[PDB]
Design a protein around this motif. Structure first.
Motif, PDB file in Angstrom:
ATOM      1  N   UNK A 149       0.845  -1.172   0.000  1.00  0.00           N
ATOM      2  CA  UNK A 149       0.000   0.000   0.000  1.00  0.00           C
ATOM      3  C   UNK A 149       0.894   1.240   0.000  1.00  0.00           C
ATOM      4  N   UNK A 150       0.481   2.216  -0.793  1.00  0.00           N
ATOM      5  CA  UNK A 150       1.161   3.492  -0.793  1.00  0.00           C
ATOM      6  C   UNK A 150       0.974   4.149   0.607  1.00  0.00           C
ATOM      7  N   UNK A 151       2.042   4.788   1.088  1.00  0.00           N
ATOM      8  CA  UNK A 151       1.965   5.661   2.293  1.00  0.00           C
ATOM      9  C   UNK A 151       0.778   6.648   2.241  1.00  0.00           C
ATOM     10  N   UNK A 152       0.528   7.215   1.069  1.00  0.00           N
ATOM     11  CA  UNK A 152      -0.521   8.211   0.893  1.00  0.00           C
ATOM     12  C   UNK A 152      -1.802   7.545   0.341  1.00  0.00           C
ATOM     13  N   UNK A 153      -2.341   6.634   1.138  1.00  0.00           N
ATOM     14  CA  UNK A 153      -3.626   5.974   0.882  1.00  0.00           C
ATOM     15  C   UNK A 153      -4.277   5.839   2.225  1.00  0.00           C
ATOM     16  N   UNK A 154      -5.571   5.596   2.258  1.00  0.00           N
ATOM     17  CA  UNK A 154      -6.203   5.392   3.527  1.00  0.00           C
ATOM     18  C   UNK A 154      -5.612   4.174   4.258  1.00  0.00           C
ATOM     19  N   UNK A 155      -5.426   3.072   3.545  1.00  0.00           N
ATOM     20  CA  UNK A 155      -4.902   1.846   4.176  1.00  0.00           C
ATOM     21  C   UNK A 155      -3.455   2.056   4.608  1.00  0.00           C
ATOM     22  N   UNK A 156      -2.652   2.732   3.769  1.00  0.00           N
ATOM     23  CA  UNK A 156      -1.219   3.010   4.065  1.00  0.00           C
ATOM     24  C   UNK A 156      -1.092   3.809   5.368  1.00  0.00           C
TER      25      UNK A 156
END
Length: 115
Positions: free
Chosen positions: A89-96
């Motif tokens: 997951x990207x750092x800049x995602x809700x899950x990240x």
């Protein structure tokens, strides 16, 4: 070494304390990505990429059934949840962002309870 032991750290409450930490992780609002195993049929890439899937429900079952030999093996599985999350997951995602927040939350509880 043989017949030479450091003083015995009391580990008799570790099971209960790990359960409490886990409850606190389960009930955090940002736990939702982590509560259940990632559905390997429905999430392309996950199966191949994440060699050791881990989630809170799987840790809870392992805990409840004496599959953690000690508190370090418990912390390894919790950290695996977050390490997996960062891998996929990207750092800049809700899950990240959820994963970073939960890891922070866990590490403080870990230190405050045991260190």
């Amino acid at each position: 070494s043989m017949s030479v032991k450091k003083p015995k750290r009391d580990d008799s409450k570790d099971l209960a304390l790990c359960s409490m930490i886990l409850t606190e992780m389960e009930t955090h609002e940002d736990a939702w990505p982590f509560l259940l195993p990632v559905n390997l049929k429905l999430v392309p890439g996950y199966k191949k990429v994440i060699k050791k899937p881990m989630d809170f429900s799987t840790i809870r079952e392992k805990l409840s059934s004496g599959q953690y030999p000690n508190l370090e093996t418990f912390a390894l599985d919790v950290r695996l949840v977050f390490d997996n999350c960062e891998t996929f997951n990207e750092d800049d995602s809700d899950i990240g962002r959820a994963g970073h927040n939960m890891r922070k939350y866990f590490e403080k509880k870990w230190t405050d309870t045991f260190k």
